[PDB]
Design a protein around this nucleic acid. Structure first.
Ligand code: MG
Ligand code: MG
Ligand code: MG
Ligand code: MG
Ligand code: MG
Ligand code: MG
Ligand code: MG
Ligand code: MG
Ligand code: MG
Ligand code: MG
Ligand code: MG
Ligand code: MG
Ligand code: MG
Ligand code: MG
Ligand code: MG
Ligand code: MG
Ligand code: MG
Ligand code: MG
Ligand code: MG
Ligand code: MG
Ligand code: MG
Ligand code: MG
Ligand code: MG
Ligand code: MG
Ligand code: MG
Ligand code: MG
Ligand code: MG
Ligand code: MG
Ligand code: MG
Ligand code: MG
Lengths: 87, 70, 101, 116
RNA sequence: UGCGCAGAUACCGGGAGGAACGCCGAUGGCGAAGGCAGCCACCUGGUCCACCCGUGACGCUGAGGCGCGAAAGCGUGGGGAGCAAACCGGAUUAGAUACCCGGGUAGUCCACGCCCUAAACGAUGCGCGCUAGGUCUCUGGGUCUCCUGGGGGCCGAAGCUAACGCGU
């Protein structure tokens, strides 16, 4: 799965400042990593539909946060997209 | 009639290799005693069942036995 | 890497030449899958509750190993190959849940 | 022509008939009887009196081979399942032990529509 | 009817093969619904509790769309023990195109692709706020006769209801 070793490495990469665990940037990154872990898990296991629901909901939560970032500060939104390579 | 947990020590419910204690939870046949007769909690019965079933695969606990009566 | 317990029951008819071989065979397979061994309990001859391979008894081995998780099934498959090997059950180690404490 | 003098007696009790087999200790049969072996033909075979006589017919046949000690094995629910046993105890054959070995599946085979 | 002297039924040993998981098992648990029970490992979703740390309204519902969707049924290839539409028989009967009995093909299982229905039921759409309690229970936390969450039941305040009933 995803160990806390890899987890902190993503948070500390996207934290707006030391000690920041909840920024929209941190959340979108953490979501992104579970997206790829699941989407690579669904490359094979094409018949696992129950888990496939979690991925739909994950993708929704990511777009909602990105739609929020776009509204408030459109410069950081481009930075977060270009650093994660989405859209 | 006494219940199994009542007359017993402090034992590991997750140890599938201790037959002397696990044998106590099987009946005259190889079946697992219900919670009424084991005195175990809901969670304790769920744990005992899988560990009993584990020992059944190692050959330590019987799948079924023969009743000498009637 | 997680910590697993390897249970092995083999044919309890083996002399020392065959028993040592089957055991060192298990050793070589653990090395090839990178299983670091922590402790071991050899119970030996035991009365089985039902005949396994027509044989009423079995010779028991128990290993506590820490090994890569993705290699578990390939290790189990490698153990069940030998003929004298009869049962192979690999279990993820757990906390010793007490009862009647 | 055998003189086993001890062995096992199997009782197979169904609702349509009861039949008894008598074997040597390793399980090979010696003599046997049923509700049809005695005169009964139809649903009378499933009666306990038929099970009584079938047990005694098989018991007397085992006497000819010298049977004295008997271990009893019972398989199946049915009328005269018990009446077959009580006939064995007083047949003159000493009943060593009685065991119920009736095969019960772990839900492996779909039963006939009758049993669902 | 059928099976049995070509030796069945019953009994012991050996072997093959397929399907389903007894006890545990619960009035229980999990999931959005369909639905999910041997055991082991790996991959993986959801969910709940404590801390009060971070973000700072980022929320709700949702026409279309998209994905999922018991059984049965369809296509291709496998598989086929037991059950078994159709069908072949035996009885019953006034008749039996049925209930009962002996057989038995599709199918039921696997893979890949369709099909999109149901009493798919809580016959009760989703989210949030408010309004007496008592009791049984699953699962967390707690200074652990108890207090406090999150589920699953039963009685029942106020109230609602045509009535049955519903009732944190
Ligand atoms: Mg082998
Ligand atoms: Mg009859
Ligand atoms: Mg004939
Ligand atoms: Mg013929
Ligand atoms: Mg046989
Ligand atoms: Mg075959
Ligand atoms: Mg039950
Ligand atoms: Mg639910
Ligand atoms: Mg349902
Ligand atoms: Mg899991
Ligand atoms: Mg999980
Ligand atoms: Mg705060
Ligand atoms: Mg602030
Ligand atoms: Mg929604
Ligand atoms: Mg829609
Ligand atoms: Mg579709
Ligand atoms: Mg369908
Ligand atoms: Mg289907
Ligand atoms: Mg088909
Ligand atoms: Mg049939
Ligand atoms: Mg039929
Ligand atoms: Mg007809
Ligand atoms: Mg006719
Ligand atoms: Mg009529
Ligand atoms: Mg529709
Ligand atoms: Mg409404
Ligand atoms: Mg507590
Ligand atoms: Mg509640
Ligand atoms: Mg009520
Ligand atoms: Mg009122």
């Amino acid at each position: 799965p995803i160990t806390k070793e890899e987890k902190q490495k993503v948070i500390q990469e996207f934290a707006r400042f030391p000690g920041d665990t909840g920024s929209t940037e941190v959340q979108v990154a953490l979501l992104t990593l579970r997206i790829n872990r699941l989407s690579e898990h669904l490359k094979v296991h094409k018949k696992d539909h129950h888990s496939h629901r979690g991925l739909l909901m994950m993708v929704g939560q990511r777009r909602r946060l990105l739609r929020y970032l776009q509204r408030e500060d459109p410069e950081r939104y481009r930075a977060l997209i270009e650093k994660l390579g989405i859209r | 009639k006494a219940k199994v947990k009542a007359t017993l020590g402090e034992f590991d419910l997750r140890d599938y290799r201790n037959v002397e204690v696990l044998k106590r939870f099987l009946s005259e046949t190889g079946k697992i005693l219900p919670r009424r007769r084991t005195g175990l909690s809901a969670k304790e019965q769920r744990i005992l069942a899988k560990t009993i079933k584990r020992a059944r695969i190692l050959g330590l606990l019987p799948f079924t036995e023969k009743l000498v009566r009637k | 890497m997680r910590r697993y317990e390897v249970n092995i029951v083999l044919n309890p008819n083996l002399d020392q030449s065959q028993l040592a071989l089957e055991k060192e065979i298990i050793q070589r397979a653990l090395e090839n899958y990178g299983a670091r061994v922590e402790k071991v309990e050899e119970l030996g001859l035991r009365r089985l509750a039902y005949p396994i391979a027509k044989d009423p008894q079995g010779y028991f081995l128990w290993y506590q190993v820490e090994m890569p998780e993705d290699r578990v099934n390939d290790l189990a498959r490698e153990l069940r190959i030998r003929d004298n090997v009869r049962r192979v059950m690999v279990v993820k180690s757990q906390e010793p849940f007490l009862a009647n404490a | 022509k055998r003189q086993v003098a001890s062995g096992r007696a199997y009782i197979h009790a169904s609702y349509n008939n009861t039949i008894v087999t008598i074997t040597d200790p390793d399980g090979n049969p010696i003599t046997w009887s049923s509700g049809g072996v005695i005169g009964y033909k139809g649903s009378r075979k499933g009666t306990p009196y038929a099970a009584q006589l079938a047990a005694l017919d098989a018991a007397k046949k085992a006497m000819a081979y010298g049977m004295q000690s008997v271990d009893v094995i019972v398989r199946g629910t049915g009328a005269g399942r018990e009446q077959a046993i009580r006939a064995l105890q007083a047949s003159g054959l000493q009943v060593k032990s009685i065991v119920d070995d009736t095969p019960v599946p772990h839900n492996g085979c779909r039963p006939k529509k009758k049993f669902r």
